[PDB]
Amino acid sequence: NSNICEVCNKWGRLFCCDTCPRSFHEHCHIPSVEANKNPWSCIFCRIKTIQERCPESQSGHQESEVLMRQMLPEEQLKCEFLLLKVYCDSKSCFFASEPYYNREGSQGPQKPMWLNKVKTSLNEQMYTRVEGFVQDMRLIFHNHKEFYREDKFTRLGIQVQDIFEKNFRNIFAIQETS
Numbered sequence: 640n641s642n643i644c645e646v647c648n649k650w651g652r653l654f655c656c657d658t659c660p661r662s663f664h665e666h667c668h669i670p671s672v673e674a675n676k677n678p679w680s681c682i683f684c685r686i687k688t689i690q691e692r693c694p695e696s697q698s699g700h701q702e703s704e705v706l707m708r709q710m711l712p713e714e715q716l717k718c719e720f721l722l723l724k725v726y727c728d729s730k731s732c733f734f735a736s737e738p739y740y741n742r743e744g745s746q747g748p749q750k751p752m753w754l755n756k757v758k759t760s761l762n763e764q765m766y767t768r769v770e771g772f773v774q775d776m777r778l779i780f781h782n783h784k785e786f787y788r789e790d791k792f793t794r795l796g797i798q799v800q801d802i803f804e805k806n807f808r809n810i811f812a813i814q815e816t817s
């Protein structure tokens with residue numbers, strides 16, 4: 640097993656996966672690491688098993704059809720994983736916790752959004768469709784672009800959104816296009 644958390648790259652109280660060499664802090668893993676369960680398989684292993692059980696799940700999909708899927712167990716798991724992939728980028732720190740807005744020449748967004756709020760929403764099963772989750776995720780970056788305007792800090796929103804969008808396309812096997 641690794642000696643650092645796969646998500647935040649720090650040592651600490653880690654839980655180790657029984658089917659691969661990754662380790663996690665308790666609340667870095669999504670869902671939070673389960674109390675008992677021996678053996679324990681992490682989210683990366685569980686996502687890999689889904690593909691192995693149904694190889695055709697990797698054939699290309701249209702984004703519009705993906706978004707309308709109901710949040711059944713396997714879609715729930717894929718959203719958890721995609722959220723996890725965002726938290727794996729160190730730049731996610733800027734978007735994790737509840738923001739505030741007081742900048743000369745800007746007004747705060749009508750609907751603030753942050754990664755820990757989306758984490759809670761998934762945990763409490765508040766999204767009925769994939770679209771719910773993806774809308775909130777995109778809203779995080781949109782709110783950041785609009786607020787920071789021409790400050791170069793707007794780029795952080797672009798950069799973390801690109802991580803989100805690449806992972807979305809990979810996890811949900813969106814049809815490759817030019």
Ligand SMILES: [Zn+2]
Nearest residue numbers: 644647664667
């Ligand atoms: Zn961690």
Ligand SMILES: [Zn+2]
Nearest residue numbers: 656659681684
């Ligand atoms: Zn694993």
Ligand SMILES: [Zn+2]
Nearest residue numbers: 692693694695
């Ligand atoms: Zn099959």
